Amino acid sequence: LTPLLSGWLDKLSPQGNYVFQRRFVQFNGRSLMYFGSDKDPFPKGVIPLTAIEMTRSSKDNKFQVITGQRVFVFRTESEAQRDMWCSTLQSCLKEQRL
Numbered sequence: 001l002t003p004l005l006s007g008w009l010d011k012l013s014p015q016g017n018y019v020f021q022r023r024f025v026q027f028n029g030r031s032l033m034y035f036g037s038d039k040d041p042f043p044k045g046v047i048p049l050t051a052i053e054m055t056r057s058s059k060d061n062k063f064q065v066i067t068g069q070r071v072f073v074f075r076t077e078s079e080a081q082r083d084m085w086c087s088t089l090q091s092c093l094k095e096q097r098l
């Protein structure tokens with residue numbers, strides 16, 4: 001619903017060691033969806049904001065979205081992009097608990 005935040009991010013894969021995959025991710029304020037392509041109609045994965053337990057920045061231009069069961073690692077192109085993604089998720093997380 002009105003996908004406020006959109007971008008191509010490098011998402012960490014659980015397979016292998018430090019192997020990323022280019023996914024087009026969107027954030028509408030209710031769930032974090034990632035697609036194989038922005039032209040793909042159905043997402044490769046959906047992470048509801050209710051399931052999000054925390055979101056924290058990483059060493060490089062990277063941020064972690066931590067749920068109850070899994071952690072998603074996304075890599076941006078710049079620290080500014082990472083900070084915008086991380087602040088937006090933190091803002092929504094803070095308001096969803098109030």
Ligand SMILES: CCCC(=O)OC[C@H](COP(=O)(O)O[C@H]1[C@H](O)[C@@H](OP(=O)(O)O)[C@H](OP(=O)(O)O)[C@@H](OP(=O)(O)O)[C@H]1O)OC(O)CCC
Pocket residue numbers: 011012013014015016017019021023034044045
């Ligand atoms: C150092 C060894 C290299 C190596 O092994 O790297 C192996 C990689 C990974 O291969 P694969 O594409 O099968 O990995 C799966 C993939 O990362 C899925 O992510 P999405 O494409 O965004 O759907 C994973 O699913 P989710 O993250 O839950 O979305 C899937 O995880 P699950 O098993 O379903 O929990 C991954 O398995 O091969 C490549 O494509 C990269 C080529 C090397």
